[PDB]
Design a protein around this ligand. Structure first.
Ligand SMILES: [Cl-]
Length: 171
């Protein structure tokens, strides 16, 4: 098996991952914004960017925001949602958490959230986190509430890619 760095390099060559902002580097101990993760998902799952539509009210969520076409694509696909449903705030510069990433990936991979999940996750996420751990996307000791490291995100994305590639329909 590949190291995390090798998985990063493979996903970067494939156009799925980028360097930490302002770099081309793996920076495996750093964290990742929800905007960046939306782009990962689009690339990972072959989603279509959506230009000229804005489903959120965040300040500076507009045509000049590079991430909007990706955020809109993951929104249309049902993978990501507002952080604050009432204010329709996506929190694009907020950091993606382990449990948020788990929900995205479980949903994209059509995995069933675990009924009666018992774990550290926030209530809404227990079933998703559980399903993600059971599927090997995150280790059992990951803190669901924590910001995911780039290592964790590389390892999860790489595993989701491998799973998805087991359908003859994979892009
Ligand atoms: Cl989300």
């Amino acid at each position: 098996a590949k190291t995390t760095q090798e998985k990063f390099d493979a996903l970067k060559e494939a156009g799925v991952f980028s360097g930490y902002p302002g770099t081309t580097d793996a920076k495996l101990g750093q964290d990742m914004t929800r905007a960046e993760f939306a782009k990962v998902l689009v690339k990972l799952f072959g989603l279509k960017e959506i230009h000229g539509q804005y489903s959120y009210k965040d300040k500076n969520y507009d045509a000049k925001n590079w991430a909007a076409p990706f955020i809109e694509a993951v929104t249309a696909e049902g993978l990501m949602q507002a952080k604050d449903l009432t204010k329709k705030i996506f929190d694009f510069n907020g950091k993606i958490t382990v449990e948020e990433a788990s929900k995205t990936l479980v949903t994209a991979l059509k995995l069933e959230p675990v009924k009666d999940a018992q774990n550290k996750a926030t209530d809404w996420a227990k079933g998703y986190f559980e399903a993600a751990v059971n599927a090997g996307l995150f280790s059992k000791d990951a803190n669901p509430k924590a910001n995911a490291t780039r290592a964790q995100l590389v390892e999860a994305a790489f595993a989701a890619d491998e799973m998805s590639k087991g359908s003859g329909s994979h892009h």
